[PDB]
Each structure stands twice: as structure tokens, then as C-alpha cells.
């Protein structure tokens, strides 16, 4: 979807950060630096098509575009960029605190009125497409209003006003996390998670606007527009980008089939494909070849209906594909299917059709299940009720049944390994893992910006352990041995 979200980290310029704030752990100065960078990095790998920046409201040395006092801009409103990470790395530790003294000092008053106003000006500056806007703010106090109410009034008044503008806010507890402690100026209209903020997302690039739409039909008389979305795919790799030896820029790739006849040139028209079949030379052109790849026009002829007798536990082609009735050009799509979405639990006879992605693609016998709802507690209607068109195997796809073909064996071993099977178990968290191999590469890739061997090597609860979960299930499994002579040597 066209649209760009923006989130900006707002930090204060006064004492409170450099002091640990009644907590033996690292100062809110320190812990912020670590957390923001971690979530910075996550957003970087999340997207580059996104605008980022950080500013220090308050200052001892003015440094912003508009040159208003107590304003220190540190990051320009930027897309993610490795040099930025390069310059952000060195804020860490007491040395970073020294820099903070060098760059601005430490400690300066503030006025959220100007602070909020100039931030909106920052957003008014960017002309890019605008989807969403949010602010990450940091403080240790529960209320800046230990002074005249005019600032407090001005702050809250335009807090609603920027709410009319539509900026979602979240104040983090830099004091005692949670504890119902920090609530004095923020139980109002003003809108713990810190570790989960850092542990929020890792190695993901969000996509949008799913492709592959086509039109269905009932009989050759009528066709209906419908948008087919894709649920899942395989893991992709980033396209490698060639670079020069040391100036490190790409150069052309230029395939040019030279001729041994004269050293001259060849034409694609001169190219006509060949099958070397013994003495039977076969010479066909590309387009007649490409036409041979076609059998029928992109379309869906409905075969009919089919009960819940298929789905033999032997066949699965490429993953099925979401279907949604879209008013692309056929005026009226879901109005017909207003009667089938209900006709799902009350009717399990499924339907199938062959499918053609486009011309040059074989027709694909494919079966459909209309889709149901699992709207979650907070109205989370994941997998909207549509249709799921599963493929079906072809004759050439089916494999031979193994020739060794006999009857099963005793359940005396079932007795022993009952205790195995119900002892250790997991929750089937389908969201308990990613590709650790892949993200490690990312970790390897970007590691060449901070001079560290490999950062945050993570292998979550996805590999079994020869002793940890062996004995978590217990050596009872070691005790259960009822098949004599383990054939292994």
C-alpha cells in the first residue's frame, strides 16, 4: 500500500538521564542508548522506505533547523543508513556521556510547548507519502509540571490537537518499570515493554500489495473479477550486488554470444532453439516453443463439486493461495459469494477447477476450500473468510509405493513409549522460530560496520538437545528399551 509511516525518538536534555534514577542498573541515559540502537537496527532491516530521526529537546548549545532555544537536533529526518549506525555506536558508556558533555553538555531546562510544536514542524517538512506517525519519548519524571500551569495547559491542549493530527504516543518507564508509579501527567489524554521493544522484531522486511490477481468464471457465459492473494512462500535471499575491485561500484553484465565464424555479431532473430536427438536434429523457434507452452487462456472453468473425500495424505503441490472477491472490473463479485461463505460449515462438498496463471502456463487442476473466520479477541480477523485453492497432483507427480509392503508390528513397544510421548511436549507455537541460518548472515553482513565477530547469535528453541531435553523428558526414555539389539553399530 502506498504510504509511509514515521516514528521519531524524543529524548530530553537535562540531568535525569545520566543518573540511574533510583535504580542500581544502568542510567536511563545508558539504557536508552542501548535500546534505541537495538530497535533502530530492527527498523533498519525492517525497511529503508521509512523516515527516522532523533532529537534532544533542551540544550545548552542550540542545534536545530529553526534555531529555537533548548532544542538539540542530533539526527536529521533520515532513512536508515550505515554511516548513521556508525556514528550512533560511540554514544555508549561513560565515553558517550563525555561526548554528550562535549556535544551539548548535560542539563538544560525545557518547554514541551515549543518541543511538540517544532516536532510537528519536522513532520511538516517531509513531503513524502505519509501513512502513519508516532513518537517515542523518554523521561524519568512523572510530570514536568512542577512549575506554572501555562506550560502544562499548552502541552495538554495541543496534545489533543496533535491527537487530532493523529500522533500516537507511548511514554516508557525509565524509573521503576511498571509499579503503577509514573502516572501524574499521563493518566490524562496523553497516550515494562522496553525489553520487548528491543525483542520486538528481528530480521524482517515487511511486504505489501500482494500480486497474482485473475478472474474466475462459472460457465463460459460469465466471468467474475476476484483478487487472489498469497499467504506464504519460501525464504528469499537478498540480490547480490556486484561492485568494483576497490572503487566498489557495479558495472554492466553484457551477455553477447560471440561467433566462431567471423568474430562478428548474432541476432536474436538468428537464434532458433535446437533439440539434439541423436541424428534427429530438432530446430524450433522460441515463440513457437513458447506457444507450445500454452494450452488455454488464463481462466478458471469450475469443474463442479466434490465432497470431503480428497486430501489423501500423500500429495501436496505448491502452497495454496488466498482468494478474495474483488470488484476489479466485474461489477459485483462478493454479492454472489455472500451465500457461500455461510455455505462452508453447512456444506463441505468442495469445488475444483483447473487453473492457468497466464498464457505460457499449463492449466492446473486445483481444488478450492472456501475460507472461514478466526477473528481473535481484540477483533483480529486474521485469514479473512475467502477461499483457499489447493493444487492437486498429476499422474506424473505421484511416486511409486515402496515395494516392501507388509503388516505392522506389536503394541508392546507402544506401552513403553507411551511414557515417552506424553512426558515431553511443546505448545505447537507456529510462531516460535524463524530461519536462524538466514538472519545469522544478516548478522554477519552488517557486522562489517561495528568490527565485531558476529553479533547476537541466536538459536531459539528449535534444535533438540542430546542431554538437555533428553533429561527434560528424562532418562526414562533411556530406561524404556524393549526392542532387543538396537541394530546400530
Amino acid at each position: 500500500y502506498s504510504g509511509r509511516d514515521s516514528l521519531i525518538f524524543l529524548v530530553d536534555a537535562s540531568k535525569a538521564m545520566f543518573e540511574s534514577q533510583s535504580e542500581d542498573e544502568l542510567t536511563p541515559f545508558d539504557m536508552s542508548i542501548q535500546c534505541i540502537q537495538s530497535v533502530y537496527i530492527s527498523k533498519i532491516i525492517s525497511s529503508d522506505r521509512d523516515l527516522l530521526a532523533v532529537v534532544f529537546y533542551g540544550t545548552e548549545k542550540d542545534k536545530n533547523s529553526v534555531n529555537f532555544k533548548n532544542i538539540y537536533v542530533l539526527q536529521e529526518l533520515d532513512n536508515p543508513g550505515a554511516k548513521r549506525i556508525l556514528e550512533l555506536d560511540q554514544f555508549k558508556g561513560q565515553q558517550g556521556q563525555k561526548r554528550f558533555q562535549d556535544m551539548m553538555g548535560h542539563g538544560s531546562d525545557y518547554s514541551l510547548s515549543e518541543v511538540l510544536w517544532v516536532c510537528a514542524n519536522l513532520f511538516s517538512d517531509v513531503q513524502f507519502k505519509m501513512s502513519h506517525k508516532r513518537i517515542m519519548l523518554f523521561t524519568n519524571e512523572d510530570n514536568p509540571h512542577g512549575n506554572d500551569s501555562a506550560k502544562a495547559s499548552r502541552a495538554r491542549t495541543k496534545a489533543g490537537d496533535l491527537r487530532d493530527t493523529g500522533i500516537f504516543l507511548d511514554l516508557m518507564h525509565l524509573k521503576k518499570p511498571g509499579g503503577f508509579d509514573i502516572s501524574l501527567f499521563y493518566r490524562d489524554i496523553i497516550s515494562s515493554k522496553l525489553e520487548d521493544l528491543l525483542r520486538k522484531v528481528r530480521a524482517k522486511e515487511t511486504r505489501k500489495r500482494a500480486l497474482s490477481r485473475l478472474k474466475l468464471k462459472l460457465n463460459k457465459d460469465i466471468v467474475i473479477s476476484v483478487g487472489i492473494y498469497n499467504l506464504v512462500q519460501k525464504a528469499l535471499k537478498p540480490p547480490p550486488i556486484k561492485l568494483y575491485r576497490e572503487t566498489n561500484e557495479p558495472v554492466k553484465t553484457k551477455t553477447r554470444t560471440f561467433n566462431t565464424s567471423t568474430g562478428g555479431l548474432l541476432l536474436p532473430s538468428d537464434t532458433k532453439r535446437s533439440q539434439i536427438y541423436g541424428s534427429r536434429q530438432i530446430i524450433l523457434e522460441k515463440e513457437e516453443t513458447e506457444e507450445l507452452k500454452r494450452f488455454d487462456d488464463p481462466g478458471l472453468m469450475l469443474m463442479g463439486f466434490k465432497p470431503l473425500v480428497l486430501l489423501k495424505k500423500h500429495h501436496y503441490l505448491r502452497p495454496s493461495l488466498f482468494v478474495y472477491p474483488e470488484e476489479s472490473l466485474v461489477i459485483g463479485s462478493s454479492t454472489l459469494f455472500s451465500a457461500l461463505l455461510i455455505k462452508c460449515l453447512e456444506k463441505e462438498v468442495a469445488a475444483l477447477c483447473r487453473y492457468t496463471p497466464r498464457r505460457n502456463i499449463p492449466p492446473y487442476f486445483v481444488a478450492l476450500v472456501p475460507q472461514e473466520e478466526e477473528l481473535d479477541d481484540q477483533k483480529i480477523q486474521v485469514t479473512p473468510p475467502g477461499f483457499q485453492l489447493v493444487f492437486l497432483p498429476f499422474a506424473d507427480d505421484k511416486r511409486k509405493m515402496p515395494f516392501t509392503e507388509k503388516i505392522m508390528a506389536t503394541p508392546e513397544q507402544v506401552g513403553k513409549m507411551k511414557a515417552i510421548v506424553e512426558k515431553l511436549r511443546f505448545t505447537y507455537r507456529s510462531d516460535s522460530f524463524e530461519n536462524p541460518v538466514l538472519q545469522q548472515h544478516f548478522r554477519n553482513l552488517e557486522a562489517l560496520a561495528l568490527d565485531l565477530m558476529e553479533p547476537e547469535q541466536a538459536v531459539d528453541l528449535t534444535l533438540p538437545k542430546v542431554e538437555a531435553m533428553n533429561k527434560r523428558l528424562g532418562s526414562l526414555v533411556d530406561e524404556f528399551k524393549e526392542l532387543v539389539y538396537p541394530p546400530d553399530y
Binding site: 460469465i222 466471468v223 495424505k313 472490473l329 466485474v330 480477523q381 511416486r399 530461519n435
Partner: protein, 705 residues
């Protein structure tokens, strides 16, 4: 895989005897077998074939064998099948005028196959025979054929025009095929063959009894020569006491060609002028070829392309740890999602062979999560050559040893978050009983399972998984199309691919009944730009036809052009134009004649009467004498009904002075010329007692009477 095959073919008109709408089993079998051969050769499969015929006009089999081997023409011998041979199969093998025992040809097959099994490496012996049952049967050879299939152990397969397991169909069921309503020699051959072949193959016999149409569509020979799953050396380790070796096998694959469309030029038809050259210039305004080894392969990071080597990434990458396979997680079978899947292949895993203990353990292990309805999450690291795969293994049911199949499960990275409103709450549209019935009308009318009884498990009356990728044979169609016919363009549309895939017509017509009213219930409208782009096949319906103008060779086609951009000449040129249907410019120009007769000027009516009296010859010479006489009778009355003393008196004057009639529509004009005179005029009538108009009338009637 390896096999031994001998081609026992049929030749005979009775064995090509058929009915319109159903192809000749001679040709049906030939199409299936050239399919076998094209798959045999195009896919580069090695086998030794041999061709023998029965019912041949004459015999070529050297073994007379008591004249039981007559009409047997041995054609091919042990060599790899070749395109010319298959071309011979298409060409030479045509239904003759001779019938010989199919069982005698069966003895031919065992003889040659036993000749060809002498020291020849073969992993399979198979026999191929097809006959529409119009040849004599026999019984004296039952013992020798049984001992041949029992001792020499040569497999065989065949099909009939009858299926054992309405509308005419090339591959579907046409008219009902009664194997009892046929002549008894067919049935006797049918009975003798079936008891033999259920004796040899056991229970592999009844399945290969199709109608020749059904074998023409679905699997008939594919299964006999099919690729078996290949072993995978693997091991299952659980805990630290027990570890069992396992063998994995793939079940689903994307069919593809090992070969490539080798590039040859059209002028030299060879690869020897297409030698590779791919060069890389510095892409600056100044091009500058960079040496390939000078490459650096960086990756995009944010807006930056951080330069990366390969050997580095070759080192600090992470990989799966070996060809290992062991379960990790557990949960019940109900938690799985039909939608939450990957795995382009399907993999079936069993124990390592020659070890029944591992099979017993797996068979025992299957029982647990089967009686427990349990599913296990097994980690899949097939080897170090890729990252580990992940997902749940589900049990597989079977009449024998069960199985487990690993399926990949979605990552967080690969999951889409496209969320959409629920149409159930769509206030804009609600299901109506009308569309409900429209939906229901096809729910019950249309189904592809066989539904007659509960004890009879529902099955696909028109199976779909028993049909391979259509492209490959369609490829094979054009390959032989060009191989046998180098000059012939593309192979034709070749309906039969649709027919093997066409829905059951009876079901389709059964669909035609409700879908018609269902459509008409709720017709729908569509927007524009829903059409293909080009249509430039030829400039017209056809290139051209060859007619041409003839019969006017005078050398004055023009150059004296009949210039043409109604007193006398316009009408005369119009009647000279009596060349197209002769019925025009005369039926409607008489009004012009009238208004030209208006007697406003003397030449007006004189040239008026000349035109008519010139028209009279035209219709005589333009075959319009019938309308001529029609107008003759018409004109006189038409000029007398509106009577004035000026015109008509002269009209009849000129008329009767030069009225000319020659027999047209019989003596009609002869009567017209025999009678052309006047009639006396009587006293005018008064008799007007309705208004005072008679006043002036009576005034006149009394002044001067």
C-alpha cells in the same frame, strides 16, 4: 530402471472395425504406444524392443510351428527404439485383411522374448498386446502359455473396448459396451485371456481391463513402467539409548526436463557460432571493460551497498548440522492448519531396509500417535548443503505399513498480514434465498464423487490425479510433428487433450439444466478492457479468392467512358440498366410519367407518351412484358379515374393511333389491342337535399336549366 518389451501389434480391418464417434482401437492403441515410444526415446530411456504382428497379410515369423505362426510378420528386433521405427509404426502398421489368433501371437512373444533374454541385461520383462476382439481364440496353448508366464515369468498388459475394473466419447464412455452382446469368439478370447492374466499377475489383473477409450485417456501403460522412489540413507535418534536408521522417499515433485533448448543459429543450425561472451564495462560515461576476477560482491544495506567478498561469507555463514533427522516438538493433531504449509515436494520416510527392527519400531511408533491422534514436530536437516527444514510430521494410513510425512511450516518472515473485513457482516450485501438456491442448485446437481451407497466409499468418477502434466506429450506431439515432418508447421489443435480433461458430458448437461436458470437469476455486469490484444493472423477471412472479370474483351473498357454523374433519356437509360433483376426504375417512375403528362405543355405529354411507347419495347425486350401488360391495363384506368378533357382525349388519340400489342401473358394484350375505344357519358346527377348548396344549383337549374 531397465525393462524388456516386445511389441505384439494387430493388423486387420476387423481389428479396425469401429463406429463413428469412437476411434479405431487400432488407432487408439497406436496413439498410446507411440506415446510409450516417444516417452521411451524423448526422455532418453533405454530398452530393447521387438515388433510382431498377427493377422498379417502373409507371415514373416521363421518358426512355422505347425502353421500356428502364420499371418505373423516379425518386423523389429533388439535395438533401441528410433524415430524412423516409430514412423514405420505409424506408417507401415495399417489394418490389413487378415486375422490370426492373438494367443498364437502370444506364443510368438514368449519365443522372441526368451530369445532376447539370452545373456541380455534386463531389469523387467513385459508384454504389450491390444486387440478389439475380432480374432480367433484358442485353448490348446493354455498349458505352454501358463508355464511360460509361470517359469520364464514375463509380465503382460492389455486392454479391450470394454471396461471392467452414454454419449459418444473418444476417451470417455460412449455407448454402453456389452462384452456379452458381442460375438462369442470375442467373449471366449475375453474369458480365456482374463483367467490366464488373473492367474499370472494375481490381483493385478482386473484393474487393467479398460475400454480402449478409457485407456486412451487415463493411465493404461504408465504404471507398468514407472519410476520407483529412491532410498535415502538416514537415521532417527531419540534420547541416548535408541537410534534407528531410516529411509526417506519423495512423493511430490515438479516434473521437468534434464535437457535444454540448445541454441543454434538459423543459418548454420549449430552451436559452433554462438560461442559464449559476457563482458562487463565500467558503467561510467566512459565504458571500460573490467576483468572478471576484479569483482567485488557487496550487498545492499539500507541505502548502501556494503562491499562483500565471497570467501568471508563462505566462512562465517551458518549451516544445518549434517544429514540428521530427529523429532523436536509435540502437540495434538487438531492444532495443524490446512493453510499453514510449505514443502514443494512431499517426502515419505520409512526404516532402513534389511532391518525389520527399525520397521517394527516405526510401525510401533506409528501406532502410538495414531491411537493417540498425536502429531510430532520433527526437525528436518537433510544434510549440510542447506539450512534445516522445519515442520510437523503427520501419520499416513495404509492397508499395510503406515507412513509419516514431514511438511514444512510457515516462518514469521514468509507470513503475509493482509487482513480484510468479513463478508458475513458486510452490510452492503447479504445472501438471499434466491442466490442460496442458485448456489444449492449446483451443489446437488454437480458432484464428481460416485454416490450410490454408504458401504460404497465415494470415488472420483472422473479421476484427476491420474492425469500427468499435459505439456510433455504436447511437447512430444510437436517434436514428432517436426521430426517426421520437417516442413510441416505446428501440430494441430488435437482435441484429444481436452477430451481426456473434458468434464463428463452427462454431468455437464446435468449441469446445463440448473446453471441456465442460475445464471438468468442474477446476471452480472462487467467493465471494459477484458480482451486480448492482437488478432493479426491474416488480412481478411482468407488471403484471396481467384475470380476475375471476363466476357468483355473488346478493347473499350474505357476511353469512351459511359459518362454518368426524366424526360426521355433518363427513363431510357434506366431501362437500358435492366441488367440487375430487371425490377426497378419502372415500378416507381410512373409517377414521373404522370407529372410529365400534366399537359402543362404540349411536349410534356407528347414526350410523356413517347417514353411509355418506348418503354413498351423495353419491357418486351427486357422480359417485363408481364408488368408491361399490367401497366397497360393500369394506365388507362389511372388516367380515366381523374378525368379531364385535355390530356386523356389526346392520350387515347395517340394511344389508339399507335397502340401495339404482341402476345404477352397470353392473349391479354391481344384483347387489349382488340378493344381500345371510349364510352358514352350520361347526364350528371343532382339529388342533393342535405344543404343549401342546391340553392345555387336550383338557381342555375331554373335560369338556364
Amino acid at each position: 530402471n531397465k525393462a524388456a518389451v516386445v511389441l505384439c501389434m494387430d493388423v486387420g480391418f476387423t481389428m479396425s472395425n469401429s463406429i463413428p464417434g469412437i476411434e479405431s482401437p487400432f488407432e487408439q492403441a497406436k496413439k498410446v504406444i507411440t506415446m510409450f515410444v516417444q516417452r521411451q526415446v524423448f526422455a532418453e530411456n533405454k530398452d530393447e524392443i521387438a515388433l510382431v504382428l498377427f493377422g498379417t497379410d502373409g507371415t514373416d515369423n521363421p518358426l512355422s510351428g505347425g502353421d500356428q505362426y502364420q499371418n505373423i510378420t516379425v518386423h523389429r528386433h533388439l535395438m533401441l527404439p528410433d524415430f524412423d521405427l516409430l514412423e514405420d509404426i505409424e506408417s507401415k502398421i495399417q489394418p490389413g485383411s487378415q486375422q490370426a489368433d492373438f494367443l498364437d501371437a502370444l506364443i510368438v512373444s514368449m519365443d522372441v522374448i526368451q530369445h532376447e533374454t539370452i545373456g541380455k541385461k534386463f531389469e523387467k520383462r513385459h508384454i504389450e498386446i491390444f486387440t478389439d476382439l475380432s480374432s480367433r481364440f484358442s485353448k490348446s496353448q493354455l498349458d505352454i502359455i501358463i508355464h511360460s508366464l509361470k517359469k520364464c515369468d514375463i509380465s503382460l498388459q492389455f486392454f479391450l473396448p470394454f471396461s471392467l475394473g452414454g454419449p459418444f466419447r473418444l476417451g470417455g464412455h460412449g455407448p454402453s459396451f456389452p462384452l456379452k452382446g458381442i460375438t462369442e469368439q470375442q467373449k471366449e478370447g475375453l474369458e480365456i485371456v482374463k483367467m490366464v492374466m488373473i492367474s499370472l499377475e494375481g490381483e493385478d489383473g482386473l484393474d487393467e481391463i479398460y475400454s480402449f477409450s478409457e485407456s486412451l485417456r487415463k493411465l493404461c501403460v504408465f504404471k507398468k513402467i514407472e519410476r520407483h522412489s529412491i532410498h535415502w540413507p538416514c537415521r532417527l535418534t531419540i534420547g541416548s539409548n535408541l537410534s534407528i536408521r531410516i529411509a526417506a522417499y519423495k512423493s511430490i515433485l515438479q516434473e521437468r526436463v534434464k535437457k535444454t533448448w540448445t541454441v543454434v543459429d538459423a543459418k548454420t543450425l549449430k552451436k559452433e557460432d554462438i560461442q559464449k561472451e559476457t563482458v562487463y564495462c565500467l558503467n561510467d560515461d566512459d565504458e571500460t571493460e573490467v576483468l572478471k576476477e576484479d569483482i567485488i560482491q557487496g550487498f545492499r544495506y539500507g541505502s548502501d551497498i556494503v562491499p562483500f567478498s565471497k570467501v568471508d561469507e563462505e566462512q562465517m555463514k551458518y549451516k544445518s548440522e549434517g544429514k540428521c533427522f530427529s523429532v523436536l516438538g509435540f502437540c495434538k493433531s487438531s492444532q495443524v492448519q490446512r493453510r499453514f504449509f510449505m514443502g514443494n515436494q512431499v517426502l515419505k520416510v520409512f526404516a532402513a531396509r534389511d532391518d525389520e527392527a527399525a520397521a517394527v519400531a516405526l510401525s510401533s511408533l506409528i501406532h502410538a500417535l495414531d491411537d493417540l491422534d498425536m502429531v510430532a514436530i520433527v526437525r528436518y536437516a537433510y544434510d549440510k548443503r542447506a539450512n534445516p527444514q522445519v515442520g510437523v510430521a503427520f501419520p499416513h494410513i495404509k492397508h499395510n505399513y503406515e507412513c509419516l510425512v514431514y511438511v514444512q511450516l510457515p516462518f514469521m518472515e514468509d507470513l503475509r498480514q493482509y487482513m480484510f473485513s468479513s463478508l458475513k457482516n458486510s452490510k452492503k450485501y447479504a445472501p438471499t434465498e434466491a442466490q442460496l438456491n442458485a448456489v444449492d442448485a449446483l451443489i446437488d446437481s454437480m458432484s464428481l464423487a460416485k454416490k450410490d451407497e454408504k458401504t460404497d466409499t465415494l470415488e472420483d468418477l472422473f479421476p484427476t490425479t491420474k492425469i500427468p502434466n499435459p505439456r510433455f506429450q504436447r511437447l512430444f506431439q510437436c517434436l514428432l510433428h517436426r521430426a517426421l515432418h520437417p516442413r510441416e508447421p505446428l501440430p494441430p489443435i488435437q482435441q484429444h487433450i481436452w477430451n481426456m480433461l473434458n468434464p463428463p458430458a452427462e454431468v455437464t448437461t446435468k449441469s446445463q439444466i440448473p446453471l441456465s436458470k442460475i445464471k438468468t437469476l442474477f446476471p452480472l455486469i462487467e467493465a471494459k478492457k477484458k480482451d486480448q490484444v492482437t488478432a493479426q493472423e491474416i488480412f481478411q477471412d482468407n488471403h484471396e479468392d481467384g475470380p476475375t472479370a471476363k466476357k468483355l474483351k473488346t478493347e473499350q473498357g474505357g476511353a469512351h467512358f459511359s459518362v454518368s454523374s426524366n424526360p426521355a433519356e433518363n427513363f431510357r437509360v434506366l431501362v437500358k440498366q435492366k441488367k440487375a433483376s430487371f425490377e426497378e426504375a419502372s415500378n416507381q417512375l410512373i409517377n414521373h410519367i404522370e407529372q410529365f403528362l400534366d399537359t402543362n405543355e404540349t411536349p410534356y405529354f407528347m414526350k410523356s407518351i413517347d417514353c411509355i411507347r418506348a418503354f413498351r419495347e423495353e419491357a418486351i425486350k427486357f422480359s417485363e412484358e408481364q408488368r408491361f401488360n399490367n401497366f397497360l391495363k393500369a394506365l388507362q384506368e389511372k388516367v380515366e379515374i381523374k378525368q379531364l378533357n385535355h390530356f386523356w382525349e389526346i392520350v387515347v388519340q395517340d394511344g389508339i393511333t399507335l397502340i401495339t400489342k404482341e402476345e404477352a401473358s397470353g392473349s391479354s394484350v391481344t384483347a387489349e389491342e382488340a378493344k381500345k375505344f371510349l364510352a358514352p357519358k350520361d347526364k350528371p346527377s343532382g339529388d342533393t337535399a342535405a344543404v343549401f348548396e342546391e340553392g345555387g344549383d336550383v338557381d342555375d337549374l331554373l335560369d338556364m336549366i
